[PDB]
Write a protein that binds this ligand. Structure first.
Ligand code: XYP
Length: 206
């Protein structure tokens, strides 16, 4: 149902998470399957997601081929991302496949390559977080990014294609912790309605 504070659980088969740091507010409404809506106001950082959490024992290859069909009405007022998001451990990595954004195309780095997939082209980037919040407390970890060259708010995201592309460029991943269609807000406000979000693993939906 309605979530306005940091929370992890399972709704309609999908692992959802609400996460924000202090400042401003956010509201997440959990709808059928992987669908949810999101509103935020005067946040520093906020994340809204529904996908799949893993027990950190398998590589993406061992999990299997991952793919998400999604559609969203994406209405940010400032900096925000509509993306597939998640983590690995050993190495600890925060990752992004961004299809849309607000006023700023992330991450502000030099591309390491590109991948052409799902009817578009993405620049690939690697950045570094030093002693920042993580799924494992304050930590130092890399971020991997695929960022579409033009905004899109519905389609298929061939998640594993990006994973393979990253690893080809020497951006290696560890054991899967999570994969999830995600709305992020950074020092901004806005709203979003994810009316479609289906995660398939080996062609089988959650
Ligand atoms: O990399 C940035 C991250 O550090 C911040 O917390 O949220 C916005 C991102 O672009």
């Amino acid at each position: 149902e309605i979530v306005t504070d940091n929370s992890t659980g399972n709704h309609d088969g999908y692992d959802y998470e609400f996460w924000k740091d202090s400042g401003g507010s956010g509201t997440m409404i959990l709808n059928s399957g992987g669908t949810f809506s999101a509103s935020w106001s005067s946040v520093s950082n906020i994340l809204f997601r529904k996908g799949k959490k893993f027990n950190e024992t398998q590589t993406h290859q061992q999990v299997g081929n991952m793919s998400i069909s999604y559609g969203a009405n994406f209405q940010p007022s400032g900096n925000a991302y509509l993306c597939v998001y998640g983590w690995t451990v050993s190495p600890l990595v925060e990752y992004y496949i961004v299809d849309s954004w607000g006023n700023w195309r992330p991450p502000g780095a030099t591309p390491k390559g590109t991948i052409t997939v799902d009817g578009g082209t993405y620049d690939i980037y690697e950045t570094d977080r030093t002693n920042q919040p993580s799924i494992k407390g304050v930590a130092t970890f890399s971020q991997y990014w695929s960022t579409r060259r033009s905004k899109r708010t519905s389609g298929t995201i061939s998640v594993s294609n990006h994973f393979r592309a990253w690893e080809s460029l020497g951006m290696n991943m560890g054991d899967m912790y999570e994969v999830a269609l995600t709305v992020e807000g950074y020092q901004s406000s806005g709203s979003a309605n994810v009316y479609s979000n289906t995660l398939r693993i080996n062609g089988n939906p959650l």
